[PDB]
Amino acid sequence: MKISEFLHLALPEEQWLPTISGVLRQFAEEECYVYERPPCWYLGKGCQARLHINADGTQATFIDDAGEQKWAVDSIADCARRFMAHPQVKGRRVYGQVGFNFAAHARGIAFNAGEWPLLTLTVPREELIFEKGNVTVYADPLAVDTALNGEAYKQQVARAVAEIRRGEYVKVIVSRAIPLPSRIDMPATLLYGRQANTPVRSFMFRQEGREALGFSPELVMSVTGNKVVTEPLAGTRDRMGNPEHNKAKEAELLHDSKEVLEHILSVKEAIAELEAVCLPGSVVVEDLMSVRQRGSVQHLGSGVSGQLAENKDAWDAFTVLFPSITASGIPKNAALNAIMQIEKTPRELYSGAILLLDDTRFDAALVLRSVFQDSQRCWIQAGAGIIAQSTPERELTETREKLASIAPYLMV
């Protein structure tokens, strides 16, 4: 039983995000969740009920006010379904994070565990929903050098290009972590970062000593009723200039054969993924290869949709779609294998998903253009789609173009 209150803040638009970050500052050190899905910002505080999957997928724990329960881990998706069905959870927004290694675990691909949970789902104790200067309450500058270690990355890209030329796989996203000098101030980074971006969703969370914040450029998946959508963005140029340099870069992208190829190969794989969980004949491209503006960078983007088959649910669709093809590679299983052989730090949540599940929707945003901090590390991370035609130098520059989406706006 939660009490609710509605407040009209007589606030100008300019003050809406400043007010949201100011609330977040008041949350201090408490566990919390922030999700932007226009026209709303959803803020959760504390933990009423949580599902926790540990880093190697061997232990599932359900926690609520009756205590901890261990659940069987025969399928993480079944644990998720059990969570969502629970009396503590039905009819409440659930805030979730899914780590990169959830994929290897679901697919029976051996992997070296990182430190972060594979999956968590949380119902918060308190919530604030901001919309157009109204609020509903439910209650009971860093300098970072993105050029550094750029040499070792070019080598990783070389290896990938060489492995693609040998036929091992067709596309792989190779990424790099940039260790940061200190922990960051989440509220301020959210404020400055967000105004410098135009993401499909924004998020921030703090849970069990781990935090992340980011400006998600695309959906892994959205399900509303029986309709499932995925939004592959792939093929990039900067937009770090005048409207003229940007338009020239847009033009240079829409017609560059290499980028078009990398885009369309990814879209075809997304179609194939949806066809696995959808009614025959229902999978269509609703928007084909249009340019999407994302702060420092612009990308070719497509929207693909289908109707879920009678025997499939949103967790089946999620398991197939995860991680985004555009953040992993083609064929997906081969690219996942390659990422674990080429990359030398755990991705953790990078290239994973942030979830908001509610009455009408299962919403899953791709974790890119994000910052991560825990007891051991504080970092940003960005990657690039590598294909046969890729060259190490362009791909290093491309990772810098993407890092410029967040790195300038990291605040202490």
Cβ 128 to a second copy shortest distance, Å? 33
Return the number of the residue (363 or 401) whose C-beta is nearest Mg ion.
Answer: 401
Q: Which of 53, 170, 177, 386 binds a second copy (CB under 8 A)?
A: 170
Return the number of the residue (43 or 265) whose C-beta is nearest a second copy.
Answer: 265
Q: Which residues bind Mg ion (CB under 5 A)?
A: 236, 384-385
Question: Does residue 25 belong to the site contacting a second copy (CB under 8 A)?
Answer: no
Q: Which residues of 42-76 are buried (b: 16+ CB within 10 A; e: fewer)?
A: bbbbbbbbbbbbbbebeebbbbbeeeeeebebeeb
Q: Is residue 197 helix, strand or coil?
A: coil
Question: Does residue 252 belong to the site contacting a second copy (CB under 8 A)?
Answer: no
Q: For residues 108 and 411, what is the distance between their CA atoms, to the nearest angstrom?
A: 40
Q: Which of 59, 112, 134, 389 binds a second copy (CB under 8 A)?
A: 389
Q: For residues 79 and 257, what is the distance between their CA atoms, to the nearest angstrom?
A: 44
Q: Is residue 96 helix, strand or coil?
A: strand
285's contact among a second copy, Mg ion, none, with CB below 5 to 8 A by partner kind, is a second copy
7's contact among a second copy, Mg ion, none, with CB below 5 to 8 A by partner kind, is none
Return the number of the residue (8 or 255) whose C-beta is nearest a second copy.
Answer: 255
Cα angle at 234 between 228 and 236, to 5 degrees? 145
Token pair for 245: 């340099």
Q: How many CB atoms lie within 10 A of CB 118?
A: 28
Return the number of the residue (144 or 261) whose C-beta is nearest a second copy.
Answer: 261
Token pair for 323: 């991680």
Active-site residue identified among 31, 127, 218, 231: 218
Cβ 317 to a second copy shortest distance, Å? 19
Q: H/E element holding 119?
A: strand 119-123
Q: Which residue is nearest to Mg ion (CB)?
A: 236
Nearest Cα to 335, choosing from 97, 104, 152?
Answer: 104
User: Please, are residues 151 and 22 in contact by the beta-carbon 8 Å criterion?
Assistant: no
Q: For residues 96 and 123, what is the distance between their CA atoms, to the nearest angstrom?
A: 9
Amino acid 297 reads V
User: 395 an active-site residue?
Assistant: no
Contacts (CB under 8 A) with a second copy, residues 256-285: 257-258, 260-261, 264-265, 267-268, 271, 281, 284-285
Return the number of the residue (164 or 186) whose C-beta is nearest a second copy.
Answer: 164
Phi-psi region of 139 (alpha: psi -120 to 50; beta: other; left: phi over 0): beta
Cβ 236 to Mg ion shortest distance, Å? 4
User: Please, are residues 160 and 172 in contact by the beta-carbon 8 Å criterion?
Assistant: yes
Nearest Cα to 14, choosing from 135, 186, 187, 191?
Answer: 191
346's contact among Mg ion, a second copy, none, with CB below 5 to 8 A by partner kind, is none
Return the number of the residue (101 or 381) whose C-beta is nearest Mg ion.
Answer: 381
385's contact among a second copy, Mg ion, none, with CB below 5 to 8 A by partner kind, is Mg ion
Contacts (CB under 8 A) with a second copy, residues 350-369: none
Q: Pattern 287-326, binding to a second copy, x per CB under 8 A?
A: -xx-------------------------------------
Residues at the site binding a second copy, with contacts judged by CB under 8 A? 170, 255, 257-258, 260-261, 264-265, 267-268, 271, 281, 284-286, 288-289, 389
Question: Any idea which residues carry the catalytic annotation?
Answer: 218
